[PDB]
Amino acid sequence: HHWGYGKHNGPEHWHKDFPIAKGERQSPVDIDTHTAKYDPSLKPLSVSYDQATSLRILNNGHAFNVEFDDSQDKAVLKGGPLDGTYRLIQFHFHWGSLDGQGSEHTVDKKKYAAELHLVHWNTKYGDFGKAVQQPDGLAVLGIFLKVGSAKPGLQKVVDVLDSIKTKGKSADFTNFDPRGLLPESLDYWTYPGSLTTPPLLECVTWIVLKEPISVSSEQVLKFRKLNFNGEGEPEELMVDNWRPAQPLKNRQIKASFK
Ligand SMILES: COc1ncnc(NCCc2ccc(S(N)(=O)=O)cc2)c1[N+](=O)[O-]
Ligand SMILES: [Zn+2]
C-alpha cells in the first residue's frame, strides 16, 4: 500500500508515511501575483543547457523522468535567486485527466493543463542524494503548459512514451535538447519550498516561470495514455499525478519582474 495519487493513497494520505507533508515550507502553492513582491535585486536566471546529455527515459509509476548525465558541469542553472551552481539531473511533468487541471502550482488560483519540473542539485553537495538533505540542495525550474499550438521540441519525448507505457519500463533517450521546452521569457517567481512527491523534503528553491509554453491537445493526450500500474496489472491511466496547492505559512513569493 504505497503512496500514489488515488482516493486511498493520494496526497491527503501522504502525511501518515511522510509527516513533513504538513510542514512549514511545503510545495506547491498558489502564486497570488498581486501579493508577490517585485525584487529588483533578483538577477536574471542563467540557464546553460548547451551541453546537456540526456541518457534515458523512465516510467516510475508516478510520472516519467527524462534523466541526464550529471557527472560533469554540463547543464547548469545559476543566478536568479541562487547562490552558486545547480546541475540538471532529470525533468518530468505533472498533468491532468482534462485540460482544466494538471499543474501543481497555480497562478491566482488558475490551474494549467500540466507543469514541467527541471530538477537541479547544488554542486556544493557533491550529488543528488546528499543535496536533498539540505535546505538549499535543489533548484527546480517550473514551467506551465497550456493546450494550443504544438511544442515541436516536445515531440521526441511524446513519441517514445508508447515504449514505456507501464511502471518500471525504461528506454534509451539520448541527444534530447531541453532548450526546446523553454518559453521566450525567463521572468519568474521564486519561493522556498519542497519536493511535491514523497519524501516531500524541504530542500527546494522554486523558480516558476511566468510564461507558459503551448503544447497541442494530441501531445497531452499521449501523456494520458501512460499507465500507473506495471505490465500485466489492471490498467490505471497515469492522469492527475499533481499535488494540490499547500498553505503558504510563513513565506514570501518574490517576482523577478514588475
Ligand atoms: C535518497 O535519495 C532521494 N531522496 C529524496 N527524494 C528522492 N526522489 C525524489 C526526487 C524528486 C525530485 C523532484 C520532485 S518535484 N515534483 O518537486 O520536481 C520530486 C521528487 C531521492 N531519489 O530517488 O533519488
Ligand atoms: Zn515535479
Side-chain angles (χ1 to χ4, degrees):
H1 185 86
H2 268 283
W3 67 271
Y5 290 95
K7 179 104 292 232
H8 297 288
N9 63 355
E12 294 320 316
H13 292 278
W14 296 353
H15 70 96
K16 288 174 283 178
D17 274 345
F18 300 100
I20 196 75
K22 299 184 171 286
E24 298 306 306
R25 66 177 276 186
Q26 288 291 290
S27 289
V29 298
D30 177 57
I31 294 155
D32 177 337
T33 57
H34 287 293
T35 283
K37 167 88 178 167
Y38 170 59
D39 184 352
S41 61
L42 284 169
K43 308 175 107 218
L45 203 53
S46 173
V47 187
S48 305
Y49 292 164
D50 41 288
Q51 311 279 282
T53 303
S54 62
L55 296 169
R56 201 172 73 132
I57 185 189
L58 168 69
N59 178 336
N60 63 21
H62 307 295
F64 66 80
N65 293 172
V66 170
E67 305 155 346
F68 288 77
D69 169 7
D70 64 349
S71 69
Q72 297 184 72
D73 259 332
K74 276 149 155 195
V76 301
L77 184 70
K78 69 172 211 201
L82 306 167
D83 288 332
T85 284
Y86 292 69
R87 206 171 287 173
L88 180 62
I89 177 171
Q90 49 102 334
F91 72 78
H92 60 273
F93 299 82
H94 305 262
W95 59 93
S97 54
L98 305 149
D99 300 344
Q101 64 198 43
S103 63
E104 290 201 315
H105 292 87
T106 57
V107 178
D108 299 328
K109 303 298 187 97
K110 171 181 169 71
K111 291 171 179 78
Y112 285 84
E115 180 172 336
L116 163 69
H117 286 160
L118 297 126
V119 184
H120 312 73
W121 57 267
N122 198 324
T123 55
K124 82 183 166 140
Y125 305 125
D127 67 15
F128 181 85
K130 288 338 142 338
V132 305
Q133 313 188 216
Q134 314 304 141
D136 54 349
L138 306 188
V140 178
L141 175 58
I143 302 179
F144 294 123
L145 279 60
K146 62 189 200 175
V147 173
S149 83
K151 194 70 176 169
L154 177 65
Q155 192 65 30
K156 299 267 146 276
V157 172
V158 162
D159 276 334
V160 78
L161 307 179
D162 79 292
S163 85
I164 55 155
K165 187 188 197 180
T166 51
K167 175 169 78 203
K169 306 215 180 158
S170 75
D172 288 331
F173 200 69
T174 61
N175 301 284
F176 182 76
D177 193 334
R179 295 178 292 185
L181 299 175
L182 304 176
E184 292 176 7
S185 176
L186 297 178
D187 279 356
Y188 64 87
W189 295 283
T190 184
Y191 76 96
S194 63
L195 301 179
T196 68
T197 53
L200 305 178
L201 297 169
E202 290 175 341
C203 61
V204 184
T205 300
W206 274 99
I207 300 167
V208 181
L209 295 194
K210 169 162 98 162
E211 182 175 350
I213 61 167
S214 185
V215 299
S216 71
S217 66
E218 295 81 18
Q219 280 181 320
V220 66
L221 214 79
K222 298 183 188 185
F223 287 15
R224 304 182 183 127
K225 284 199 146 101
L226 291 168
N227 282 189
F228 282 132
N229 57 273
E231 191 182 5
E233 291 159 22
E235 190 180 26
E236 328 183 304
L237 285 188
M238 182 179 280
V239 299
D240 300 314
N241 54 354
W242 50 270
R243 190 184 189 191
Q246 301 300 298
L248 193 55
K249 295 188 184 187
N250 200 59
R251 321 177 263 173
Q252 189 173 225
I253 307 172
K254 292 167 174 172
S256 77
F257 64 87
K258 291 178 284 179

